[PDB]
Write a protein that binds this ligand. Structure first.
Ligand SMILES: CC(C)NC[C@@H](O)COc1ccc(CC(N)=O)cc1
Length: 121
């Protein structure tokens, strides 16, 4: 759920999900339309797509358990949905960490009309 995802993000990047990754670019937060603005925005695009592969799961509210094995994020056994949701979140958290260097404040609160383009999962 958002609770685990938010904790994962903070632990990985030192940034709080809200407001750092909740209104960034075209896909971090709202999701919607267009072409991803940068690497961080692409991480959210892929994350949206990952959730998109789980039509009968409820990623925002279904809680999962995860632990740290000397740095590495390890998803613990739960229901199949919980396992898959955790893998999606884990990938996003790592992706955010991998692209922290290019994270740009100019993409925060990015306006909707500037999100144009075509990009299928
Ligand atoms: C706690 C606050 C007030 N509530 C807003 C809450 O809905 C969190 O906002 C969100 C919801 C969903 C997303 C996209 C994602 N992380 O997959 C990013 C940010």
């Amino acid at each position: 759920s958002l609770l685990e995802f938010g904790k994962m993000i903070l632990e990985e990047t030192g940034k709080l999900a809200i407001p750092s990754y909740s209104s960034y670019g075209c896909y971090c937060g709202w999701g919607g339309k267009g072409t991803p603005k940068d690497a961080t925005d692409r991480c959210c695009f892929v994350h949206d797509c990952c959730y998109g592969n789980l039509p009968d799961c409820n990623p925002k509210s279904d809680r999962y358990k995860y632990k740290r094995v000397n740095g590495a994020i390890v998803c613990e056994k739960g229901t199949s949905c919980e396992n898959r949701i955790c893998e999606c979140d884990k990938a996003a958290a790592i992706c955010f960490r991998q692209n922290l260097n290019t994270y740009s404040k100019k993409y925060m609160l990015y306006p909707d009309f500037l999100c144009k383009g075509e990009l299928k999962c």
